[model samples]
Target: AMGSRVVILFTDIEESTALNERIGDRAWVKLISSHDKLVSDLVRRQSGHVVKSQGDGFMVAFARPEQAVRCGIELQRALRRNEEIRVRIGIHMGRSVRRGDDLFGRNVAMAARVAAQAAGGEILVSQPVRDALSRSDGIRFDDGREVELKGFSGTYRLFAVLA
Candidate 1:
């Protein structure tokens, strides 16, 4: 909230529409709730703030990129503990403008795009995120592949966290 540079994390519920239709609206909501709490709890523990909750996922704000990266890893890893829960998270670190609990700017859009690129149970990151990683960090990253994220300019590097 105080800084212009923030780590933006967005999540997606893979095949959410189909799941809602198959499970009934109320049942699907209950199923999503626990997983949402898992993410919310981890974000808070990592000192990140929950910006907002989507129907099936969440948006989190972190002051530092590494904190966000670790949080994202934990979120994805946590999903593994519960077979019923699966989520894809994408994080991008850059300058953003926040207004009344909502974020607006290309950075936010990019974060969403990165999230979209991920499959369920995967974590994706923009190049800035790759560069922000510390060598001693336990997590491993894939060779940042230059790819086309929907919107924005030419090829941008996209990184994946290895399981």
Candidate 2:
């Protein structure tokens, strides 16, 4: 089922350009490597993979919605340990036509728009994720706002971690 419908996880380094300008290139490089390791390690442990990355952003793919949500939550927790780091993560479960490791379709685009709405240190998930979650899963969500998501066919109700 996951192979056909993948859960998308998108992440970005917040204010990265200004961050580098303040920290200098060398230290910025170090932080970049550290961030990459943290994300890669957690993703691997959860059986997800980093499909690709650009600049300070990563596009990760998971086989299940639960794994994607878990990865996003834990990544935020781990990132909080370093005040120098702030990230925005977005997740959605949807059907997309993929060709050569790239997701193409409205769902994939919607995932990107969802990620764009998140502030640093936050995770936003599409409403489909709500249906995918289990009551016993130990994760709770505050009813997120309904937004047009910049430009889409309809408004989407997103979810944020409750605590």
Candidate 3:
């Protein structure tokens, strides 16, 4: 194989600044700690690990697209334990050049852009990811929509993951 296909996932808390201000510093620290641990634990269970840490967000990767989707869905569900926090997740399956613990290239940026498009509590995926998954896997998605991504040419079709 020229390149191994991987799934890139980006997750971040929505309106984190507002939440932090509302909760105060000490509680915010504890809240973020719990969230980070939750994400790391669940991601590790799927054989994935964090690639980048952006304060309240994490960029993680998995060798298997199925596992990535599973982790994304479960992560969304698990975060519901804290009603005050809403996490947006985005996934894309593609080839990337992995350097140490980091992955780089267009796909990784695309994954991040897609995650930025997601609303809190939503799991958005690129077309490649949707096509890669087996419909029989029981993971459903909404109709794809075309949107212009930042720093990318043309519009891309993205789907919303529906349980």
Candidate 4:
């Protein structure tokens, strides 16, 4: 079983499916592999752990919400320089239940929903994480909104990093 609290960062390549259709399967695989490596390396260097990888997406955990957000921003920025691959990320902070090297919890599911709300090259975060990063400098938030996510009863407040 997992411990009490952790920060989750869910990331996906934007327009990847469409890109796959346009570029064909072989090229898509190469592109996705490169993108995955970049993300994994950056997350690891920033003291984050990659909990899982789902095809062209990933679920990562961080000890601190600030680290998660900073890593997300850096990853997005790095990918943005490449016109070929577009990435988006979502971060949330909550408790999780561990099950054999994997985590299961509403927070994880919510993180996926938040990631779906993000645009290409964007980093979206929950309100709690945003508050945690308030003391930090050079962080800007877009005019984000609250949305009702699947499997959750109430609307969640989400903010996107300026990109």
Which of the numbered candidates is closest to the native, going by highest TM-score? 3
lDDT of 3 by residue, 57-120 (tens): 9999898778888898899888775537898999987888888777878888889999999999
Q: Write down the lDDT of every candidate, Cα atoms only.
A: 0.83, 0.84, 0.87, 0.84
- Residue 131 lDDT in candidate 1: 81
Clashes within 3 Å, all models in order: 0, 0, 0, 1
Q: How many clashing residue pairs are found in candidate 2?
A: 0
lDDT of 2 at 141: 86
Q: How high is each candidate's TM-score?
A: 0.91, 0.92, 0.93, 0.91
Superposed model 3: Cα runs more than 4 Å off: 1-3
Better-scoring candidate (TM-score), 3 or 4: 3
Q: Once model 2 is optimally superposed onto the true structure by TM-score, how far is the C-alpha of residue 70 displaced, in angstroms?
A: 0.7
Clashing pairs in 3: none
Whole-structure CA lDDT of model 3: 0.87
Local lDDT at 126 for model 3: 95
Off by over 4 Å in 1: 1-3
Please, what are the lDDT tens digits per residue for candidate 4 over residues 11-35?
A: 9888778889999998888888888
